[PDB]
C-alpha cells in the first residue's frame, strides 16, 4: 500500500500492551503471522518499523546496505550520550570513524604486535586465574568479564592490566553498571514516554557520571601517548588516531579529533566487554548442560592442539565441531534479538511500502537465527545447526549474530578470536563439573529488554 501495516496504538501509551515487557521478540513474532515481514509499531509516539525474517532483513541490510545504513537514537540513548563516536554516529562522522576503526582493528593493523597475540596472552592469563580458584565452586561472571575488557585495553593503550590492578577493576565497574542500568527492564519506559527523563533523571545522570569518568581516564592516557608518541611506530589505536589526526591537520575542519576518541574508545569498551562477556559465560553454562558436546570438543582440542602448546585461529579450520559449537552458542542465545535500532538515510519504497527519512528500523535478528525452515528445532541447542552428516562444518547465510550489512559489527573478527580462543583454552586446561547435575540446571535465556543473559550458575574448574 503506502505505509507498512501494524495494530492500530492506543493514545500517548502507542502500541506497549500489545509488545508487552518480558519477551519483545516472541510479540514480533506474533505480529509479523497477522501484519507479515514489514510492520509498523508505536513506542508511544514514535514509529518504528519492523522488520521480520531472513528475506526482508537481507533485502534491507544488504540489497538497500546504503539506505538501512543509519541508526536509530532512542530516548534514553539520545539523553544519555554526550558526544558521538561509532555506535550512535551518523553520516560522514560514521562513516570516517567506522572505516579507520575496521583498518585500525585488523589483525596488524596497529604496528608489529598482533590481534591474535594480544588475545592468546589473555587466553593464558585467563586460565591462570582459573587456575587460582582451586578447582572450588565459583560464579565465573567476574573472571570472564576480565578477559574481553583486558583485549580492548590492550587494544586501546597497547597493555593489559593484572586482575586485581584497581584502575583496571574501577573501569569495569563503570561497564558493569552502566550494563545493569541498560538491562533493567523498566528503562523501556523511558523510550515509550521520553518526557519521563525530565521528571526522573537520576537514571541518565548516572550513565552520563559513568560515561564522564570512562572519557577522563582515557584522556589521562591519550595524553600520556602524545607524550611518548613515535610516528612510524604505532603501538595501539590511540597512537593510530593520533597520527590520523596529523594525516588531518590540513583540511581542519576534520571528523577525528581528542574528543571523538574518547567516544569511540567508549563505545568500544562498552560493545566489546559484556557481549563477549555473556556470550562466554552462556558457552560455558551450555556445556554444563551438555557434557557430551564437551566431552567431543576436548578429543578435537587434545588431537588437532596437543597439551604443551596454546591454542591459535590456524587450529579453527582443522576443528569443525568446536567452530559449530561457539556457532551454535551464538545461534541459540540470541544476545541481541533486535540487535542496535537502524534508521533509513532517505526517503525509500521497500516492498511497496514508502518509509520516509529518519524512521527507526528494528531488525529481528531472532527471526534470522531461529529460523524454523534452516535450524530445525531452533528453540534446541544442537551443534549438527552448523554440522553435515560427516561432521565438517556447514555454514549459513541465516548465522547473523552480528547482524548484517554497513552497520555489521566491527568487533566481529576480535569477538570470534576471543570466543574460539578462550573456550579451547579452558577446555584444554580444565573439566568443568557442576554442583547442581546436569539435568537439574536450566539453560532457556532470560530475555529482560533487548538482552538475552544467562541465569545464575556455578561451576568447578578441575585441571585435567
Ligand atoms: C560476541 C560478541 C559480540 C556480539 C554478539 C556483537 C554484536 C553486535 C551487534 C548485533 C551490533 C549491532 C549491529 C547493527 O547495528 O545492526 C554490534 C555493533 C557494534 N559492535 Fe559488536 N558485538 C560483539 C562484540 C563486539 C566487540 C568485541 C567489539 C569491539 C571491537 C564490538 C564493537 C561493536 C561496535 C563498535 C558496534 C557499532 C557498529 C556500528 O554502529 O557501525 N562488538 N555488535
Ligand atoms: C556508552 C553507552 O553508549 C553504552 O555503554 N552503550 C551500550 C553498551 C553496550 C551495548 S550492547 O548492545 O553491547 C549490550 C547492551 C546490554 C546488555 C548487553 Br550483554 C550488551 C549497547 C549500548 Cl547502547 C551508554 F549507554 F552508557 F551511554
Same mark, same amino acid.
Given at each position: 500500500? *503506502?505505509?507498512?501495516?501494524?495494530?492500530?496504538?492506543?493514545?500517548?501509551?502507542?502500541?506497549?500492551?500489545?509488545?508487552?515487557?518480558?519477551?519483545?521478540?516472541?510479540?514480533?513474532?506474533?505480529?509479523?503471522?497477522?501484519?507479515?515481514?514489514?510492520?509498523?509499531?508505536?513506542? *508511544?509516539?514514535?514509529?518504528?518499523?519492523?522488520?521480520?525474517?531472513?528475506?526482508?532483513?537481507?533485502?534491507?541490510?544488504?540489497?538497500?546496505?546504503?539506505?538501512?545504513?543509519?541508526? *536509530?537514537?532512542?530516548?534514553?540513548?539520545?539523553?544519555?550520550?554526550?558526544?558521538?563516536?561509532?555506535?550512535?554516529?551518523?553520516?560522514?562522522?560514521?562513516?570516517?570513524?567506522?572505516?579507520?576503526?575496521?583498518?585500525?582493528?585488523?589483525?596488524?593493523?596497529?604496528?608489529?604486535?598482533?590481534?591474535?597475540?594480544?588475545?592468546?596472552?589473555?587466553?593464558?592469563?585467563?586460565?591462570?586465574?582459573?587456575?587460582?580458584?582451586?578447582?572450588?565452586?565459583?560464579?565465573?561472571?567476574?573472571?570472564?568479564?576480565?578477559?574481553?575488557?583486558?583485549?580492548?585495553?590492550?587494544?586501546?593503550?597497547?597493555?593489559?592490566?593484572?586482575?586485581?590492578?584497581?584502575?583496571?577493576?574501577?573501569? =569495569?565497574?563503570?561497564?558493569?553498571?552502566?550494563?545493569?542500568?541498560?538491562?533493567?527492564?523498566?528503562?523501556?519506559?523511558?523510550?515509550?514516554?521520553?518526557?519521563?527523563?525530565?521528571?526522573?533523571?537520576?537514571?541518565?545522570?548516572?550513565?552520563?557520571?559513568?560515561?564522564?569518568?570512562?572519557?577522563?581516564?582515557?584522556?589521562?592516557?591519550?595524553?600520556?601517548?602524545?607524550?611518548?608518541?613515535?610516528?612510524?611506530?604505532?603501538?595501539?589505536?590511540?597512537?593510530?588516531?593520533?597520527?590520523? =589526526?596529523?594525516?588531518?591537520?590540513?583540511?581542519?575542519?576534520?571528523?577525528?579529533?581528542?574528543?571523538?576518541?574518547?567516544?569511540?574508545?567508549?563505545?568500544?569498551?562498552?560493545?566489546?566487554?559484556?557481549?563477549?562477556?555473556?556470550?562466554?559465560?552462556?558457552?560455558?553454562?551450555?556445556?554444563?548442560?551438555?557434557?557430551?558436546?564437551?566431552?567431543?570438543?576436548?578429543?578435537?582440542?587434545?588431537?588437532?592442539?596437543?597439551?604443551?602448546?596454546?591454542?591459535?585461529?590456524?587450529?579453527?579450520?582443522?576443528?569443525?565441531?568446536?567452530?559449530?559449537?561457539?556457532?551454535?552458542?551464538?545461534?541459540?542465545?540470541?544476545?541481541?534479538?533486535?540487535?542496535?535500532?537502524?534508521?533509513?538515510?532517505?526517503?525509500?519504497?521497500?516492498?511497496?511500502?514508502?518509509?520516509?527519512?529518519?524512521?527507526?528500523?528494528?531488525?529481528?535478528?531472532?527471526?534470522?537465527?531461529?529460523?524454523?525452515?534452516?535450524?530445525?528445532?531452533?528453540?534446541?541447542?544442537?551443534?549438527?545447526?552448523?554440522?553435515?552428516? *560427516?561432521?565438517?562444518?556447514?555454514?549459513?547465510?541465516?548465522?547473523?549474530?552480528?547482524?548484517?550489512?554497513?552497520?555489521?559489527?566491527?568487533?566481529?573478527?576480535?569477538?570470534?578470536?576471543?570466543?574460539?580462543?578462550?573456550?579451547?583454552?579452558?577446555?584444554?586446561?580444565?573439566?568443568?563439573?557442576?554442583?547442581?547435575?546436569?539435568?537439574?540446571?536450566?539453560?532457556?535465556?532470560?530475555?529482560?529488554?533487548?538482552?538475552?543473559?544467562?541465569?545464575?550458575?556455578?561451576?568447578?574448574?578441575?585441571?585435567?
Amino acid at each position: 500500500k *503506502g505505509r507498512p501495516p501494524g495494530p492500530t496504538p492506543l493514545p500517548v501509551i502507542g502500541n506497549i500492551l500489545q509488545i508487552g515487557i518480558k519477551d519483545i521478540s516472541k510479540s514480533l513474532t506474533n505480529l509479523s503471522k497477522v501484519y507479515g515481514p514489514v510492520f509498523t509499531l508505536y513506542f *508511544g509516539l514514535k514509529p518504528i518499523v519492523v522488520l521480520h525474517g531472513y528475506e526482508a532483513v537481507k533485502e534491507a541490510l544488504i540489497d538497500l546496505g546504503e539506505e538501512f545504513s543509519g541508526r *536509530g537514537i532512542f530516548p534514553l540513548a539520545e539523553r544519555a550520550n554526550r558526544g558521538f563516536g561509532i555506535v550512535f554516529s551518523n553520516g560522514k562522522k560514521w562513516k570516517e570513524i567506522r572505516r579507520f576503526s575496521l583498518m585500525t582493528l585488523r589483525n596488524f593493523g596497529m604496528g608489529k604486535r598482533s590481534i591474535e597475540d594480544r588475545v592468546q596472552e589473555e587466553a593464558r592469563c585467563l586460565v591462570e586465574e582459573l587456575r587460582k580458584t582451586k578447582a572450588s565452586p565459583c560464579d565465573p561472571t567476574f573472571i570472564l568479564g576480565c578477559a574481553p575488557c583486558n583485549v580492548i585495553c590492550s587494544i586501546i593503550f597497547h597493555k593489559r592490566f593484572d586482575y586485581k590492578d584497581q584502575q583496571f577493576l574501577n573501569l =569495569m565497574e563503570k561497564l558493569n553498571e552502566n550494563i545493569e542500568i541498560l538491562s533493567s527492564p523498566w528503562i523501556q519506559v523511558y523510550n515509550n514516554f521520553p518526557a519521563l527523563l525530565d521528571y526522573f533523571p537520576g537514571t541518565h545522570n548516572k550513565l552520563l557520571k559513568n560515561v564522564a569518568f570512562m572519557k577522563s581516564y582515557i584522556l589521562e592516557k591519550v595524553k600520556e601517548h602524545q607524550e611518548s608518541m613515535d610516528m612510524n611506530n604505532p603501538q595501539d589505536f590511540i597512537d593510530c588516531f593520533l597520527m590520523k =589526526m596529523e594525516k588531518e591537520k590540513h583540511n581542519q575542519p576534520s571528523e577525528f579529533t581528542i574528543e571523538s576518541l574518547e567516544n569511540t574508545a567508549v563505545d568500544l569498551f562498552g560493545a566489546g566487554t559484556e557481549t563477549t562477556s555473556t556470550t562466554l559465560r552462556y558457552a560455558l553454562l551450555l556445556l554444563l548442560k551438555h557434557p557430551e558436546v564437551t566431552a567431543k570438543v576436548q578429543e578435537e582440542i587434545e588431537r588437532v592442539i596437543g597439551r604443551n602448546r596454546s591454542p591459535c585461529m590456524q587450529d579453527r579450520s582443522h576443528m569443525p565441531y568446536t567452530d559449530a559449537v561457539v556457532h551454535e552458542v551464538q545461534r541459540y542465545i540470541d544476545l541481541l534479538p533486535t540487535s542496535l535500532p537502524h534508521a533509513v538515510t532517505c526517503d525509500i519504497k521497500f516492498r511497496n511500502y514508502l518509509i520516509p527519512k529518519g524512521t527507526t528500523i528494528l531488525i529481528s535478528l531472532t527471526s534470522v537465527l531461529h529460523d524454523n525452515k534452516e535450524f530445525p528445532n531452533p528453540e534446541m541447542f544442537d551443534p549438527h545447526h552448523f554440522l553435515d552428516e *560427516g561432521g565438517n562444518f556447514k555454514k549459513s547465510k541465516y548465522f547473523m549474530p552480528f547482524s548484517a550489512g554497513k552497520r555489521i559489527c566491527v568487533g566481529e573478527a576480535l569477538a570470534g578470536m576471543e570466543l574460539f580462543l578462550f573456550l579451547t583454552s579452558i577446555l584444554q586446561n580444565f573439566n568443568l563439573k557442576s554442583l547442581v547435575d546436569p539435568k537439574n540446571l536450566d539453560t532457556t535465556p532470560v530475555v529482560n529488554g533487548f538482552a538475552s543473559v544467562p541465569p545464575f550458575y556455578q561451576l568447578c574448574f578441575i585441571p585435567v
